[PDB]
Design an enzyme around this catalytic site. Structure first.
Site, PDB file in Angstrom:
ATOM      1  N   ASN A  22       0.815  -1.233   0.000  1.00 30.51           N
ATOM      2  CA  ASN A  22       0.000   0.000   0.000  1.00 30.51           C
ATOM      3  C   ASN A  22       0.851   1.287   0.000  1.00 30.51           C
ATOM      4  O   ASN A  22       0.313   2.372   0.243  1.00 30.51           O
ATOM      5  CB  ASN A  22      -0.962   0.029   1.188  1.00 30.51           C
ATOM      6  N   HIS A  63       3.125   2.274   2.112  1.00 35.28           N
ATOM      7  CA  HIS A  63       3.356   2.751   3.474  1.00 35.28           C
ATOM      8  C   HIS A  63       4.641   2.096   3.989  1.00 35.28           C
ATOM      9  O   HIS A  63       4.923   0.960   3.616  1.00 35.28           O
ATOM     10  CB  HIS A  63       2.187   2.325   4.378  1.00 35.28           C
ATOM     11  N   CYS A  97       6.071   7.409   9.394  1.00 35.07           N
ATOM     12  CA  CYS A  97       7.099   8.129   8.650  1.00 35.07           C
ATOM     13  C   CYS A  97       6.594   8.051   7.196  1.00 35.07           C
ATOM     14  O   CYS A  97       6.348   6.949   6.695  1.00 35.07           O
ATOM     15  CB  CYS A  97       8.472   7.472   8.778  1.00 35.07           C
TER      16      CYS A  97
END
Ligand SMILES: N#Cc1ccccc1O
Ligand SMILES: N#Cc1ccccc1O
Ligand SMILES: N#Cc1ccccc1O
Ligand SMILES: N#Cc1ccccc1O
Lengths: 263, 264
Positions: free
Chosen positions: B185, B187, B222
């Protein structure tokens, strides 16, 4: 995994993991490169090793000079990929390790790879080239008739790569390895360099294309305290010329090319 | 891998790979964390998923709040490690996923882990107490009697972690993720944060000690364009450390944690 019937090649099956895939839910080219490394190590172990006791006494190791990978279909998350690998000596020059990737369900070839390895003194980092008594020890584990993953005369795997000239079209600056990038001997893993090359490919390309071919030359290693700049220029399907160099003085560590096909 | 006889836990075996080991030729704590994630993912798939159709309708996802891992013996390169995992709801607060690691040859427990997960809206990033209709959908795949990987009275997995105060004793500055650190995804993978924590542990400790326990709180993500600073201070035959990960600029906290190391 296991050595095949003739004991001259090795096969292993892998289930693609959830953290091994990119946004299209298929294995990344770095996951593929890690699997080629793994089946290569399991092949070396299955036959007694990839240094012989003779090379170990001389403080001699095998080092990668070039990696070339061509993927037709990347295996999806949960799929089983079967990989066959073998080695062949190319005289005093060095040795080659080849791989064939297949879909375990259909049996179709989904990818292929070839690598060139040279002998180097572990301490002085000097090449020296493959000796007589050392070669003989390896010859018994390699097929004697040529067996090539890339048979075609003057194919992509053997093409000379030029040096990218400044200014580069794209760049990713200040890339540094972390402990996860190191191998068991505290050296940067060869696959990390592939990742660093790909860092300067624009995201728009990654989103609309699939990587078809990558050829990467290895000239010098990035140490734990080194910083790398990854440069890329379009030379065209989309084709790119790549250069990895140490951030300060600009010493070259790798050069390569990539070929991408529109999704 | 497979669901166990009662269908309330899942087991999978892994052969430790050559690129998965450190200098001792045993699996790194990041390889271990990746395997816990993988067996968790295979457990969710084996039962129909880890969002239900109702959660996907509402744009709700499960997010990690805390990871706690304790390792007694790290599996060697070529060894087969067997991992069993299960989930349990902890009321409206959220859910817990636990793991037990074993040596496949001896059958001895070589490690254990526990994680706390909360529900969050995928778009607004706002947390929520688990609703009844959503909870009910998960309850049928979890044991109803408490099954804890860390049963102990005031065990290490539930201890509050303080915020490291400047100046830190050690630091690793300017850590940035690359494409290999992202999940499907786009991330940053939760395991990358463990790696970043460990970046500020001095090499002398890594060379003379083995990591026994790591507890890590997750407060903020982050992003792909963020830069991280990893800070570590000694708080102690055993060495203990306090850890802080914060975004390089403004110093916004992303994670805090502790590690316990035993002399080799
Ligand atoms: N050269 C060579 C070779 C052949 C079989 C297995 C491992 C090797 O390094
Ligand atoms: N690469 C590397 C490395 C080695 C020791 C400490 C930190 C690191 O990023
Ligand atoms: N909660 C929960 C749960 C239980 C079994 C498998 C996947 C899950 O997310
Ligand atoms: N993380 C990350 C990332 C995303 C796109 C391009 C380069 C990267 O390092």
């Amino acid at each position: 995994g296991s050595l095949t019937e003739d004991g001259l090649s090795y096969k292993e099956k892998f289930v693609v993991r959830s953290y091994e895939v990119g946004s299209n839910k298929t294995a990344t080219v770095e996951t593929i490169a890690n699997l080629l490394q793994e089946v290569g190590c399991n092949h070396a172990q299955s036959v007694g090793f990839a240094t012989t006791t003779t090379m170990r006494k001389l403080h001699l190791i095998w080092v990668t000079a070039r990696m070339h990978i061509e993927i037709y279909k990347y295996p999806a998350w949960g799929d089983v990929v079967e990989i066959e690998t073998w080695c062949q000596s190319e005289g005093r020059i060095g040795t080659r390790r080849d791989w064939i990737l297949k879909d375990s369900v259909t049996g179709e070839v989904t990818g292929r790879a070839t690598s060139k390895w040279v002998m180097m003194n572990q301490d002085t980092r000097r090449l020296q080239k493959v000796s007589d008594d050392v070669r003989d020890e390896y010859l018994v584990f390699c097929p004697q008739e040529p067996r090539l993953a890339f048979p075609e005369e003057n194919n992509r795997s053997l093409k000379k790569i030029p040096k990218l000239e400044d200014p580069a079209q794209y760049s990713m600056i200040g890339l540094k390895p972390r402990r996860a990038d190191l191998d068991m001997n505290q050296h940067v893993n060869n696959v990390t360099y592939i990742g660093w090359v790909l860092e300067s490919i624009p995201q728009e390309i990654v989103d609309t294309h699939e990587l078809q071919v990558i050829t990467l030359d290895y000239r010098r290693e990035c140490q734990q305290d080194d910083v790398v700049d990854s440069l890329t220029t379009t030379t065209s399907d989309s084709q790119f010329l790549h250069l990895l160099r140490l951030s300060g003085d600009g010493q070259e560590i790798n050069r390569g090319t990539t070929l991408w096909r529109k999704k």
